[PDB]
Amino acid sequence: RYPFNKRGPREHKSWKHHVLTEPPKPLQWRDPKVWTRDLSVMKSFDAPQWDLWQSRPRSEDMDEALQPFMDMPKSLKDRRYDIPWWANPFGAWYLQNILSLELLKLKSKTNAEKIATYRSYMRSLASGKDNTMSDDDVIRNIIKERWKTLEFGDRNAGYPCTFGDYIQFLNEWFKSLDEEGMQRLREHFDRRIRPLLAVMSPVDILWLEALTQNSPHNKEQLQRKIAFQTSLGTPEFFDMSKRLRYEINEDYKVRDELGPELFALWSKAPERWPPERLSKMYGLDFTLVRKILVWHHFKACYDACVEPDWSLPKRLFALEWIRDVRARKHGLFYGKMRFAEQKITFYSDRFLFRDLVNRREASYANVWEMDDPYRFLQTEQDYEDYWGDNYDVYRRMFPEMIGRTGEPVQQYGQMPIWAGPHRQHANKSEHNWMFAEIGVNVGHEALKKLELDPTNEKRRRFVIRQPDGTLRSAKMSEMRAWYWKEEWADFRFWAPQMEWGIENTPSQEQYQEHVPDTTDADFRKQRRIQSRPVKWFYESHYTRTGSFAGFQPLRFMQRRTEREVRWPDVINAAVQIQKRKPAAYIFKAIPE
Amino acid sequence: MKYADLELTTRGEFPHGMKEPAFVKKLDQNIPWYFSTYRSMYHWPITGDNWSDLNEAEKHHDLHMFYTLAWWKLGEGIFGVD
């Protein structure tokens, strides 16, 4: 019942004054070692993260590749002197073992071996030794294991390189990279590292540390844990080198599509070679084989040191292109239409008959007409969706989509005032005066364009009296001001700017607390730093599309608000997320 | 190029992202529902071709890629010849 029989609201520990002060605060005695240089804040003494640059808006970071060198004071950075790259001891080691071939001695074959090897190589007879290993595999094995055997440390002892020395070489090298340099790099990263990044597991962490020979915190307990767990499978099972061994579809190897097929032909007249002529080569299905043809074109181009046609994936996939443009138009989204969003129509069995006899009976003057790239298109709509992306082709072919013409702002003639000068002051005043007309024949959104049309004489009339007393027709902005606000956003080529995002929504809706807006280091918004140019200045104008406000912003406010869980009494509707408010507020003075 | 012989004594552990975290018994909020109930504002991947003066995607990718390559020592000993 009523909480307030027997007593009123309890004021007991309302300050909760045990929470106000800790009885120990600070001083002028703050340790210069353990604090910031400024004595601003405490230093964090846990192990260094290698990514820290991403969380803090400091600009020297971005002048160096690896993290420790970003954190380096300038005074040390000066005592790094420019010397030849191999004078760097790691560059030396790399020069000896990896880059120097001629210093490599191979075990010399006997004559028996020479003959057996030769006769195996020229004519294969089954059941024989399947090794017969090419010395190129031997060589590359020797090199890769030279990367196994490479170890860091102090170099007056056994090892060739200081860890710092190696990441030094690395750092100077990563800054040294050009476009296709770091392209070759990222490629080499995706082919080697990235798959491993997906197949990893706790069971490997020790081994993962045995690459740099670095010492872990728990090393004993991980010894035991990983011993007990790797005990539960084959040693073969658990090692990472062999985890990528097999591939689906062995008949077409990525290695053999490196040489592109008939590159000596479709190079020379790429028109007479539509995708069909080639696609008869692969025993695959349609989507896969066109995919492959794209990759061929690109490999080929990169090989002949010319630039590839980037519109080729649009041309081979044209049907998919337009399906997507139109889907994006229909359901309003930017992306690629996936399966759940297909229509649920069920066709009859013979549905294709009309088209089937149309195809079976088609005839063509030459073969180019037969399969040209553009037979996908008839009406202008098609030509508009197939080229929306090149503002080149589009701007040329559709000149009237950028409005260059408008209803000129004109001055109206004033009505004569008989009272003369006596009243001539009256219609001259402080402000502008807008007058928009309404009536049964005017102000309906349904009819809007007919109403703003210069050719229609029942056209809705506006007038504006300037503060000096003249009158002019409305500017088109003013005209449109008098209709209910209208959203233009179209999704087919570039993504329109959408509301209620991370960077869009101001604080109080997004989080229920005030969050300071600083142009640097917003941790909540996962941004490092922000330069804020004027929004639409540096971008291309066709790239500006519109704004979609047309949905519920579920973090903020939703329909049929209700408690998720009635008990315990604590949970609310899912819109009420918030941090706990403390026992009574403590205010620290903050000039600092 | 730009060499000096530097002694870097402590390198933090491997960024494998999987390390047994610190264990507690009691927790601050005993209310697990909050996990499922929490929502956020929408993360929109793209606006208008996604142009930026600071080139964020490329630059951040490359920086991560760098220390990842460093710690794997360029993945160069791990793969034999299949």
């Binding site: 005695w29 703050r30 340790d31 353990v34 964090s44 003494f45 | 870097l8 004594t9 402590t10 390198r11």
Partner: peptide, 21 residues
């Protein structure tokens, strides 16, 4: 910022931060 590389992870040499005297 450069100090983080030479510290020993478990040791927080002066947890209080106060030299006192």
């Amino acid at each position: 910022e450069y100090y983080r590389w030479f510290i020993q992870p478990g040791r927080h040499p002066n947890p209080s931060g106060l030299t006192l005297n």
